Amino acid sequence: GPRVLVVGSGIAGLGAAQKLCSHRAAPHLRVLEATASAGGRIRSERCFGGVVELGAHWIHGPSQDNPVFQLAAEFGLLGEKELSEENQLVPSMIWSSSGTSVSLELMTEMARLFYGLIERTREFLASVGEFLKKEISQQVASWTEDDEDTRKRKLAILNTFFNIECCVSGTHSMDLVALAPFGEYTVLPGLDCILAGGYQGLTDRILASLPKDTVAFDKPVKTIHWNGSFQEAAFPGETFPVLVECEDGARLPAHHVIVTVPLGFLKEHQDTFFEPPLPAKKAEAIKKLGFGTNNKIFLEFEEPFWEPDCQFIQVVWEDTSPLQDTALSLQDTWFKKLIGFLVQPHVLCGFIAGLESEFMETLSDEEVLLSLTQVLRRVTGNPQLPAAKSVRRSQWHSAPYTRGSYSYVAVGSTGDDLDLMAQPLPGLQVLFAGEATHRTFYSTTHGALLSGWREADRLVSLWDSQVEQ
Numbered sequence: 209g210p211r212v213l214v215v216g217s218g219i220a221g222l223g224a225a226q227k228l229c230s231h232r233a234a235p236h237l238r239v240l241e242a243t244a245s246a247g248g249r250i251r252s253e254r255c256f257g258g259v260v261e262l263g264a265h266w267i268h269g270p271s272q273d274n275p276v277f278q279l280a281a282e283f284g285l286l287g288e289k290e291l292s293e294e295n296q297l298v299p300s301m302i303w304s305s306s307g308t309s310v311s312l313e314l315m316t317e318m319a320r321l322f323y324g325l326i327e328r329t330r331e332f333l334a335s336v337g338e339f340l341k342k343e344i345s346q347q348v349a350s351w352t353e354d355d356e357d358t359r360k361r362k363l364a365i366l367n368t369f370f371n372i373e374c375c376v377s378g379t380h381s382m383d384l385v386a387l388a389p390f391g392e393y394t395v396l397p398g399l400d401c402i403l404a405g406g407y408q409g410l411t412d413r414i415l416a417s418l419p420k421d422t423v424a425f426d427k428p429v430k431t432i433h434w435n436g437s438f439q440e441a442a443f444p445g446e447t448f449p450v451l452v453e454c455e456d457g458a459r460l461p462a463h464h465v466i467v468t469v470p471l472g473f474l475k476e477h478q479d480t481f482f483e484p485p486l487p488a489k490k491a492e493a494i495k496k497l498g499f500g501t502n503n504k505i506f507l508e509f510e511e512p513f514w515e516p517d518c519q520f521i522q523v524v525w526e527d528t529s530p531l532q533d534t535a536l537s538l539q540d541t542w543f544k545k546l547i548g549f550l551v552q553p554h555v556l557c558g559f560i561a562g563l564e565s566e567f568m569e570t571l572s573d574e575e576v577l578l579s580l581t582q583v584l585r586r587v588t589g590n591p592q593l594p595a596a597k598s599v600r601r602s603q604w605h606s607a608p609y610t611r612g613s614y615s616y617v618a619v620g621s622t623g624d625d626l627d628l629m630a631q632p633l634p635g636l637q638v639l640f641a642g643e644a645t646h647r648t649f650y651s652t653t654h655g656a657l658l659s660g661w662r663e664a665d666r667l668v669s670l671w672d673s674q675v676e677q
């Protein structure tokens with residue numbers, strides 16, 4: 209059969225390999241993975257006696273049209289609530305940096321203002337951030353009754369919603385997120401849920417369905433040589449259009465290479481990763497699209513200091529405002545970008561996106577644990593709060609084979625750029641899959657899976673056309 213090489217063993221590469229290998233007239237296929245394990249940005253680990261997810265956490269929109277929801281149900285990875293029709297159809301403590309609780313009514317008021325504005329942006333099919341700020345500023349000019357203290361509290365609360373949105377988009381700033389394309393991203397119905405035993409159970413299940421020795425780990429690709437006529441070392445010295453050159457020196461001829469490497473990797477290395485250089489159209493989509501950093505900081509405590517019914521500890525930074533912030537501006541300290549902490553169902557998980565998140569990665573584990581212990585002592589107004597016992601944090605920007613968390617349609621790029629990312633090279637010598645190749649489900653596990661299946665289907669159609677001719 210034809211020789212296929214899949215670069216990367218995340219859910220896109222695994223989905224492509226599974227669909228191709230399950231074909232009754234299967235090709236000779238190898239998956240080349242840079243790291244020691246499969247799953248890529250789905251990365252579940254044994255930590256603090258439990259399971260922590262360093263990458264993907266939720267099935268976003270766990271309903272009928274979500275293929276990740278469908279697989280997780282087929283595989284027995286979901287609990288009873290997650291499987292329910294009620295769930296498919298669809299608890300915080302808010303702390304100010306002054307060590308006082310924030311009014312629930314005020315929080316609701318600002319959430320309605322902020323998310324109503326988000327809903328408006330999703331209908332314009334410059335930046336999301338600029339639109340929100342212009343509308344918020346207009347509303348501020350109508351806050352006649354409020355004393356300067358109330359207006360200050362309202363802007364501070366709004367700043368945390370902007371930081372939460374930075375986590376959602378995987379951007380440093382909403383001012384970097386293109387306005388017109390924003391609404392193309394599709395939200396499927398359902399109350400987002402976890403896979404209790406680990407999201408990695410999903411990719412381990414797909415991986416195990418592949419023929420033995422399909423995936424080679426610790427086998428990073430250095431350069432894909434395409435548009436050539438390359439002899440294989442053995443008889444009958446057949447010519448192949450592609451030669452995959454591995455970092456370890458391996459010379460692998462192939463008829464088709466499915467590239468599923470992250471956009472951050474392509475941004476750093478597209479100039480050396482492809483020989484000849486990618487066509488300009490594709491090179492420019494790689495450059496123009498966004499690829500931001502979002503990290504998780506897990507903190508273990510000997511005893512919980514939060515209420516047992518508490519699921520998220522939201523932080524509001526006093527005297528902060530989104531109206532002062534610009535696309536490339538930084539917060540006063542890296543930790544002011546942190547939105548708060550999800551209580552693991554005694555573990556907390558802090559979320560932080562952007563340049564402050566990349567800066568966090570440069571700090572030692574010790575600095576992060578100590579700094580966040582002081583932040584927690586500050587925001588809960590408790591100087592005797594015991595320090596966290598342990599820390600485990602993701603470092604997505606630093607990861608040489610990822611270089612960030614996920615794609616977004618940045619100012620300067622459109623949904624057409626996600627289509628350019630998916631466009632194959634001539635003769636289907638090189639195909640592209642991955643979350644940054646899906647126009648409406650980019651930045652998700654389901655987008656990545658669907659893109660893998662799309663490339664498997666494109667190849668099967670070519671092979672079927674060779675038989676007919």
Ligand SMILES: Cc1cc2nc3c(=O)[nH]c(=O)nc-3n(C[C@H](O)[C@H](O)[C@H](O)COP(=O)(O)OP(=O)(O)OC[C@H]3O[C@@H](n4cnc5c(N)ncnc54)[C@H](O)[C@@H]3O)c2cc1C
Nearest residue numbers: 216218219220242248249264265266429642643652653656
């Ligand atoms: C912090 C974080 C939170 C997220 N939260 C969610 C969430 O809750 N829900 C959700 O649906 N999505 C979420 N996502 C997004 C989701 O994880 C991804 O969109 C999806 O997993 C990407 O799959 P992929 O196959 O496209 O890429 P990857 O999973 O990154 O797979 C690409 C593979 O390519 C390999 N590789 C790279 N370079 C080379 C090379 N030169 N040679 C060989 N192999 C190479 C990598 O090691 C990797 O295994 C999150 C991601 C992160 C990081």
